[PDB]
Design a protein around this ligand. Structure first.
Ligand SMILES: [Cl-]
Ligand code: NA
Ligand code: NA
Length: 128
């Protein structure tokens, strides 16, 4: 399924080239501009654990998730991954724990040492 496909066929987008964050573009976005550090970015997403369980979804909340890019307000895989996206793009990301929640995990749903799968849509970005 989709997690296996990004694991086996995804592009390493890390600067270290350590395969910690793998990406597949599922829907090409608009234009060529990607967000800038510090921009307010608006995303829709759904996350799955490696045991198949969905652990989060913004769609189910009927509102986007909003954060400032490149500031450590989200896991490192998101700062790196969203920075690669164009407006309107949908991608899949496969995030090793060193680029996610590490050995700590994150209650209530994310265990220690968890590899995470996300589908992310970049809805908009704005320089505040
Ligand atoms: Cl799937
Ligand atoms: Na596929
Ligand atoms: Na892109």
């Amino acid at each position: 399924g989709a997690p296996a496909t990004v694991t086996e066929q995804g592009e390493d987008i890390t600067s270290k080239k350590d395969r910690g964050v793998l990406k597949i573009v599922k829907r090409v976005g608009n234009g060529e501009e990607t967000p800038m550090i510090g921009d307010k970015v608006y995303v829709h997403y759904k996350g799955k654990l490696s045991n198949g369980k969905k652990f989060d979804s913004s769609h189910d909340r009927n509102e986007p998730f909003v954060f400032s890019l490149g500031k450590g307000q989200v896991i490192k895989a998101w700062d790196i991954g969203v920075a690669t996206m164009k407006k309107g793009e949908i991608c899949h990301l496969l995030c090793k724990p060193e680029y996610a929640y590490g050995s700590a995990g994150s209650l209530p749903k994310i265990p220690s040492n968890a590899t995470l799968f996300f589908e992310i849509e970049l809805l908009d970005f704005k320089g505040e």
